[PDB]
Design a protein around this ligand. Sequence first.
Ligand SMILES: NC[C@H]1O[C@H](O[C@H]2[C@H](O)[C@@H](O[C@H]3O[C@H](CO)[C@@H](O)[C@H](N)[C@H]3O)[C@H](N)C[C@@H]2N)[C@H](O)[C@@H](O)[C@@H]1O
Length: 297
Amino acid sequence: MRTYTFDQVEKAIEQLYPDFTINTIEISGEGNDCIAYEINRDFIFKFPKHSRGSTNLFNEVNILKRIHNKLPLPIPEVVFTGMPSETYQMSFAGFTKIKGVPLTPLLLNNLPKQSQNQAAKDLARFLSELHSINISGFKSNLVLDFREKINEDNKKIKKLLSRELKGPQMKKVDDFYRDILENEIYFKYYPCLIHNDFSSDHILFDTEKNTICGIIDFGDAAISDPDNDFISLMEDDEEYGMEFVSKILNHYKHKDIPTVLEKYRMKEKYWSFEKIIYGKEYGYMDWYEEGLNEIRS
Ligand SMILES: NC[C@H]1O[C@H](O[C@H]2[C@H](O)[C@@H](O[C@H]3O[C@H](CO)[C@@H](O)[C@H](N)[C@H]3O)[C@H](N)C[C@@H]2N)[C@H](O)[C@@H](O)[C@@H]1O
């Protein structure tokens, strides 16, 4: 955590944008990586909470400029950029505001069936197009290879938990990693650009028309397994549940649905380990103790 006042936000912005005059500023959201501010009701400026989140913002800015007119839904559009320092790769970025509310599982399920299904269709089309974007211009650094990531998590957990876990417990952790890594189904996919945080909170909805009017938060995007972007929608109360995602899958013409379920299941078990790592790497320490406690069971 770094934290900001309105005067700091304004001065950072005035420095690089001296002719953009500012009336209203108020906090609009706050994520793991950035705080968001609404300026003149027409712009959302993200300011990083730490270096990690700044690097996330920098990556978001860059992917958006590559895909800005390639999708069938609106996406955030970058209008203002800050600067790199020794602490942040980018001090802030200002985006066009997208009107709408999050498409919560509550909101979704109270829609008439016809809108519900059109939502599934519109999401499938957004994903099918996103996953078909040609990635060849893209920086090779965006490639998230899932085998390497898992091998790397195993060593980070070992390094982190070696003094915290009893020998037999750490053996069982090594067992779970070995087991995941021997199953080829997690690691044979054709990589493509994926949103990689595709969930109900990043899907915006227009309640006058009852249709999806935007997709937001591209800070996690990578070139990786297209199946990541369904599994993040599958969790029953938290997200949409299986019946809805299966409609999305059918529109997307997915060919190996039992593969997605399998990755979903493993992902959900994998959450405890993500809570430990992601706790420390995002220095949020109640996740850490929680994951560790789940692991000791
Ligand atoms: N109790 C909260 C839930 O949290 C996880 O999922 C949630 C993600 O954590 C959120 O996002 C953050 O974590 C992501 C991992 O995907 C990263 O991409 C990103 N840096 C972060 O912004 C996402 N928007 C909503 C989603 N429901 C678990 O899977 C789930 O079991 C658990 O119930």
